[PDB]
């Protein structure tokens, strides 16, 4: 292990953040050395300024203030649409592990039965759930934009304080890397969520169930079999 010799501003890592980045097209990269507004210096810049919806420096900032939040929501959204469709296929009762009526289970028999175990939270009210969501989330995202307890609000993109128990947040070149592992995995989570959503619209089966159906017959059980559905006539 050798201390990555920083000393400078760049952040090359392997090859990630400089003039020579890894662009999007393998030979048809962005013309004229990539549009002049964005030349590295930050995680997640690859060069899709084709519609050009952000050309002001404040919009370049505010869209990324969206991006990191959106991606972090999608990461937990992905895992929180994956887990119990595995667990119910293994050994665990849930009611319905499919993520359409996961929210409808309150109406079913006695509220939410957790992990199939009648010794747990057992939320019978939807209204109290609404109240705690509105109250606690509005508090938390007020603290995101302002900064309150458990660490003050310094950087709204990355706070990096007593919130992190590991205390990794020290060597800045390794996090020139890891701020990018963030965004790569978060865009994976974005398009996995579009998998969830569009598969949810077209066929209405669980995404795990879509993988099982597909692997049972990859040439027949795929998107093209739904192609004649949704046709006017």
């Amino acid at each position: 292990k050798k201390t990555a010799a920083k000393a400078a501003a760049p952040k090359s890592s392997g090859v990630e953040f400089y003039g020579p980045n890894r662009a999007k097209w393998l030979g048809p990269y962005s013309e004229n050395s990539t549009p002049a507004y964005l030349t590295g210096e930050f995680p997640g810049d690859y060069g899709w300024d084709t519609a050009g919806l952000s050309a002001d420096p404040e919009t370049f900032k505010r869209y990324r203030e969206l991006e990191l939040i959106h991606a972090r929501w999608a990461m937990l959204g992905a895992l929180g649409c994956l887990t119990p469709e595995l667990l119910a296929k293994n050994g665990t009762k849930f009611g319905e592990a499919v993520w359409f009526k996961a929210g409808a289970q309150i109406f079913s028999e006695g509220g939410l039965d957790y992990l199939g175990n009648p010794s747990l939270v057992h939320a019978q009210n939807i209204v109290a759930t609404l109240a705690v969501q509105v109250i606690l989330m509005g508090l938390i995202e007020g603290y995101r934009v302002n900064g309150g307890p458990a660490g003050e609000g310094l950087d709204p993109l990355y706070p990096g304080e007593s919130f992190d128990p590991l205390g990794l947040a020290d060597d800045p070149d390794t996090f020139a890397e890891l701020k990018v592992k963030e965004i790569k995995n978060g865009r994976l989570a974005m398009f996995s969520m579009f998998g969830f959503f569009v598969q949810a619209i077209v066929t209405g089966k669980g995404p795990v169930q879509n993988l099982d159906d597909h692997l049972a017959n990859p040439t027949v059980n795929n998107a093209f079999a739904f192609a004649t559905k949704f046709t006017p006539s």
Binding site: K2, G14, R22, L26, K89, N90, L215, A216, N217
Partner: protein, 93 residues
């Protein structure tokens, strides 16, 4: 001598080594011979992978005519990628 510090890039990642590896080996791996009765070495155990994916927790039988497909498939897949990576002729050939 050999070197003075370990280079932290030794696998020089050329991004079209793997895509040409399995893409240029599997597009000719599913042709269809007289040998299997009209089937491939990529679709005939697609049947198998899905087939014993159906009954999930049961690990498949220890003589079931598809371990051969797994082993003979990877015996070529790994070889074509490991000869693709020596398609770094940037200084040698």
């Amino acid at each position: 001598a050999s070197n003075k510090s370990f280079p932290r890039d030794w696998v020089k990642t050329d991004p079209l080594v793997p895509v040409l590896g399995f893409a240029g080996w599997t597009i000719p791996a599913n042709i269809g011979v007289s040998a299997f009765g009209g089937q491939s070495l990529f679709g005939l155990f697609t049947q198998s992978i899905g087939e014993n994916l159906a009954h999930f927790p049961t690990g498949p039988a220890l003589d079931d005519k598809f371990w051969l497909y797994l082993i003979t498939y990877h015996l070529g897949l790994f070889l074509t990628i490991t000869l693709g990576q020596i398609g770094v002729q940037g200084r040698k050939q």
